[PDB]
């Protein structure tokens, strides 16, 4: 019934769905060496949000709640609240609170707090290690590493704003963060539940197409490559449109509006990811005004022209 489409937006006008930064480019490469199962930026073409995906880009990798000081340390435990400061419910059928980081690494940001009675405020440099034993957002607690042992107050609204990533602690250069490794959302040695499924190309000569950003680095030599399956704007658009899918695969053409010509074609799968016909790692060279255009509902019988 309602016709499907994708937004008229260039890549650079769009946003990464896994960290609050702009998209920069398009990348394709082989994905057999790893499990591709991000939980943010997961949405069906008819607008069903999956994993930990929520609508606003500014909520990705942010936390809210109140903090409890861990005595003898510059470390704090946040008892999480939902985005509107209401109670967080650990029984909900989601892997973690919506917007929870979906990769193992060290995220640096700032913890800010306001005291309710007099409106006095404070902020401090803060780091969350999503691979730590105490990263348990699904259970409603995460631990922050800070530069104060004294300044934060108990029972007061506290927020973490993410900035970038770091590499430290003797790890290898560019071997952290690990964008395709999911955190253990309930903490050390726990199983994740309710995941959006892993994705892979099935057809031979076919590869995923990634929407790529470079995360800001705050310290060391981190791997700042961040790939998402869908731009956050597509997530928001598909949720708004809720257009029924007429097949498993939507044929998209990447078009240069300056010439009207088609740069390449690709498949947007209904369950929410994109594939192309290419073999090997490749940085796509695209015109600045280029954008994706939905041309037809197709199936496996249609073969993508080589990208």
């Amino acid at each position: 019934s309602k016709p499907f489409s994708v937004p008229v937006l260039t890549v650079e006008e769009m946003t990464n769905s896994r960290f609050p930064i702009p998209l920069e480019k398009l990348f394709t490469g082989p994905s057999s060496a790893f499990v591709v199962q991000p939980q943010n930026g997961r949405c069906t073409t008819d607008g069903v949000l999956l994993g930990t995906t929520q609508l606003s880009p500014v909520n990705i990798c942010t936390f809210r709640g109140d903090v409890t000081h861990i005595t003898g340390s510059r470390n704090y435990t946040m008892n999480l609240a939902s985005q509107n400061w209401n109670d967080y419910d650990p029984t909900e059928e989601i892997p973690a609170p919506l917007g929870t980081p979906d990769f193992v690494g060290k995220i640096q940001g700032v913890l800010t707090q306001t005291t309710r009675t007099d409106g006095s405020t404070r902020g401090h440099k803060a780091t969350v290690y999503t691979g730590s034993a105490d990263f348990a957002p699904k259970l409603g607690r995460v631990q922050f590493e800070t530069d104060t042992d004294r300044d934060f107050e108990a029972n007061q609204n506290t927020k973490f704003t993410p900035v970038g990533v770091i590499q430290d602690g003797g790890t290898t250069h560019r071997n952290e963060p690990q964008q395709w490794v999911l955190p253990s959302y309930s903490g050390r040695n726990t199983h994740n539940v309710h995941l959006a499924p892993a994705v892979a190309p099935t057809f031979p000569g076919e590869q995923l197409l990634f929407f790529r950003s470079t995360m800001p680095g705050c310290s060391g030599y981190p791997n700042m490559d961040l790939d998402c399956l869908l731009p956050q704007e597509w997530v928001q658009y598909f949720y708004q449109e809720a257009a029924p899918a007429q097949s498993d695969v939507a044929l998209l053409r990447f078009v240069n509006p300056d010439t009207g010509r088609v740069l390449f074609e690709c498949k947007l799968h209904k369950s929410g990811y994109v594939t192309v016909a290419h073999t090997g790692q490749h940085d796509l060279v695209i015109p600045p005004n280029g954008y994706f255009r939905f041309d037809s509902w197709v199936n496996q019988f249609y073969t993508l022209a080589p990208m």
């Epitope: 016709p3 499907f4 007429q246 097949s247 044929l251 074609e265 016909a277 939905f294 041309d295 037809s296 509902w297 197709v298 199936n299 019988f301 249609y302 073969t303 993508l304 022209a305 080589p306």
Partner: nanobody, 120 residues
Framework: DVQLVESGGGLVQPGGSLRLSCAAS????????MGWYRQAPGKQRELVAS???????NYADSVKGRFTISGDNAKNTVYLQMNSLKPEDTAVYYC??????????????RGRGTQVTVSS
Amino acid sequence: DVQLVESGGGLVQPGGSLRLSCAASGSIFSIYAMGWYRQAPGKQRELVASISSGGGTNYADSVKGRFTISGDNAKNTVYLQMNSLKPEDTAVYYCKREDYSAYAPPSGSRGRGTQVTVSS
């Protein structure tokens, strides 16, 4: 509705060449894929070659390097050039087409089929 008119099949010497063609008319769409399936007695139906309007092609491994598919858009036709034919290529070859729309599910059409017999 869409109908396909097939031609080009018949008797052929082992190691000989054949050329099939399939022409589509009716409610055809600008985005489509067309190709040939073949069916041999007691064997599962097999895709032989297909071509898509974007230019992408797909071949069965068994016919790779022997068979070539190509298309003429103006004529709405596809051609299958079968070379170095073998007794195992003997089957009924039927043309298949899917028409694709931005507004509807894929619409399939199939030809009546043409016998191909590779024997001396």
